[PDB]
Amino acid sequence: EDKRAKVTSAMQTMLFTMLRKLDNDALNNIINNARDGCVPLNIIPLTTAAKLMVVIPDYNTYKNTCDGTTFTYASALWEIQQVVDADSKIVQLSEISMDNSPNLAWPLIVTALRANS
Amino acid sequence: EDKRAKVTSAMQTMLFTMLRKLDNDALNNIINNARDGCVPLNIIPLTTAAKLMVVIPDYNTYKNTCDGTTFTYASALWEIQQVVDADSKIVQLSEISMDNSPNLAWPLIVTALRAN
Amino acid sequence: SKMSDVKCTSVVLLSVLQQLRVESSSKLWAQCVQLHNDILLAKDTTEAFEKMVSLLSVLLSMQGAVDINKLCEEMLDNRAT
Amino acid sequence: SKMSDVKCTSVVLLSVLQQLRVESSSKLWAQCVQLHNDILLAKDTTEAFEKMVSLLSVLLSMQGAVDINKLCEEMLDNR
């Protein structure tokens, strides 16, 4: 399983070059978010009020994407329904503050519903 | 009416856009030849002196690709070895001339070997 | 146009997912196939890109199936190969 | 460059061949797979384009697998 992996490496490199060439704002967001550790747990849906789960790795990333109950991702707005920490405990939106950020068990998992696009 | 047949058509149209956008001399020739009915019967070989089989549909197409014993195709040179006519009977190269061409059973098939 | 580039990219992406042995998951693969076909059959770029967001999200949701940092490191080190 | 484009087209081309049920032919498919892998692993544009000529010829050698004029017809009409 050596040549196969070189072929696989080559296919993925060509894949992302096409993605880079596409220069789409929504595609760039999910690719760039994943590089920062903000990755989806399920397929990003397209129906209004459809469930999305994403890993959010740190507070700097959280502040860049979430404002109040609104999550911005893939050029769409998502209303956050649940936040859990690495212990699967519910984090109330009030505790996710700049002042309280070191007391949380990062990374967090956000469960949001699709709403504006 | 099948979604699958529609997908295949959609996939193939995009394929030629990539092929057409490449604007490759070697690729352009084999695609344009096929448009004129000059189509390969086997995989075009990559080694020196490996056999190539191609359909030649008419005399105007023959003259554009064949000079003496040289068949020009895929941006490479090929030495013609044999010509069979539409009835599988061998046709000697001296017979494939402008004056003798209607008397031949088109299409003819050239089996050539890569000179490069 | 750019319509073509998104459909072309989706065939590669499904093929990338092919190599990653996704077909074992007969629902994910069926879901991947449905998304890929919808992109090829799409009539405006909005559908191609929206469906592509979802289809690409499949690769991104696969922990360690790709190492995006590892891959992006390669592009910058290649710098036009 | 042009080379990235040629590798991408080969993945599309092999996939197109798969949709054409070429897989039932083990020996043709192996040739198609080996060429596709060589194109993705290619060192320079000459080898990539030479191998792409070979791989594409698989598609052109298949009578009716493509009706190049009918395909080229929806190309020109749709543009």
Numbering used by the authors:
A (entry chain D): 77 to 193
B (entry chain B): 77 to 192
C (entry chain C): 1 to 81
D (entry chain A): 1 to 79
Q: Could you give the paper's own sentences about this structure?
A:
Next, we crystalized the NSP7–NSP8 complex and solved the crystal structure at 2.7 Å resolution. The crystal structure of the NSP7-NSP8 complex belongs to the space group P21, with each asymmetric unit containing two NSP7 and NSP8 molecules. Despite the fact that full-length NSP7 and NSP8 proteins were prepared for crystallization, we were only able to trace the electron density for the C-terminal domain of NSP8 spanning from residues E77 to S193, with the N-terminal portion most likely proteolytically cleaved during crystallization. On the other hand, we were able to trace the entire NSP7 molecule except for residues L83-Q84 at its C-terminus. Analysis of the structure of the NSP7–NSP8 complex reveals a 2:2 NSP7–NSP8 tetrameric complex, formed by two closely-packed NSP7–NSP8 dimers. As previously observed for the NSP7–NSP8–NSP12 complex, NSP8 is comprised of an N-terminal domain, albeit with only two α-helices traceable here, followed by a C-terminal domain formed by a four-stranded antiparallel β-sheet packed against three intervening helices. NSP7 is comprised of four α-helices, with the last one moving apart from the first three to cradle the two N-terminal helices of NSP8, resulting in a mixed six-helix bundle. Close inspection of the two interfaces revealed that both the dimeric and heterotetrameric association between NSP7 and NSP8 is dominated by non-polar contacts, involving all the four helices of NSP7 and helices α1 and α2 of NSP8.
Replication of the ∼30 kb-long coronavirus genome is mediated by a complex of non-structural proteins (NSP), in which NSP7 and NSP8 play a critical role in regulating the RNA-dependent RNA polymerase (RdRP) activity of NSP12. The central unit of the replication machinery is NSP12, which is responsible for the RNA-dependent RNA polymerase (RdRP) activity. In addition, NSP7 and NSP8, with molecular weights of ∼9 and ∼22 kDa, respectively, serve to promote the replication processivity of NSP12 (5,6).
